[PDB]
Amino acid sequence: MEHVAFGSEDIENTLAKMDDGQLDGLAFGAIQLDGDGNILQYNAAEGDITGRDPKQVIGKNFFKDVAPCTDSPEFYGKFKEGVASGNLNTMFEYTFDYQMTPTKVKVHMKKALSGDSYWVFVKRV
Q1: Which of 27, 29, 45, 105 is most buried, by the most CB atoms less than 10 A from its CB?
Q2: Residue 79 sits in a domain of what CATH number?
Q3: How many folded domains does the chain comprise?
Q4: What is the rounded CA–CA span in Å between residue 9 and residue 92?
Q5: Rg, the chain, Cα only
Q6: What ranges in 35-124 are assigned the alpha helix state H?
C-alpha cells in the first residue's frame, strides 16, 4: 500500500509520480479534477467510500454529474475560487448524501504540481 498521510504538506509532490495503479494503493480517497471540474483520476479508496465505480466516473463532471451535493458555496464555491486564483489549499468536513447513506468525511483540496489541475482527497471521520 502506498505510504502517504492524509493532509501531508508535500502531498502534491508525492502523488506526482503516481499512475492510476499507484493511486489505488492509498489509504484515503483521491480524485484528480481539471479546472472545469471534470474527473481525470478517481481511486479505489474513493470508490469504497461513495459506492461509485472508478473507471466509469472518469470523464464526468464532479459538480454537475457525479457529486451535485458538493455543488454549493462551501465546496464548489471554494474550488472555483481556487481555480480562478491559481492557488487552493483547504480542509473541511462535509456530508456526502447523494443517492447513498449519508457519510461524513474530511475533504482536502489542493492544486497539483501539474499545469491546470486539482486534487480532492477524502477520508472518513
Answers
A1: 29
A2: 3.30.450.20
A3: 1
A4: 16
A5: 13
A6: 44-50, 54-57, 76-85
Q: How far is residue 100's CA from residue 21's CA, in Å, rounded to a whole number?
A: 26
C-alpha cell at 95: 456530508
Residues 6+ apart with CB under 8 A from 62: 31, 33, 37, 38, 39, 70, 120
Segments of the chain assigned E as strands: 29-34, 39-42, 89-96, 103-111, 117-124
Q: How was this structure determined?
A: X-ray
Domain extent for 43 = 1-125
Q: Is 50 helix (H, G, I), strand (E, B) or coil?
A: helix
How far apart are the C-alpha atoms of 42 and 31, rounded to whole Å? 5
Q: What resolution in angstrom units was achieved for this structure? A: 1.6
CB 107 within 8 A of CB 100: no
Which of 119, 117, 98, 99 shows the shortest CA–CA distance to 107? 119
Q: How far is CA 47 from CA 42, 55, 79, 95, in A?
A: 8, 10, 21, 16
Distances (CA, A) of 89 to 20, 58, 109: 22, 23, 6
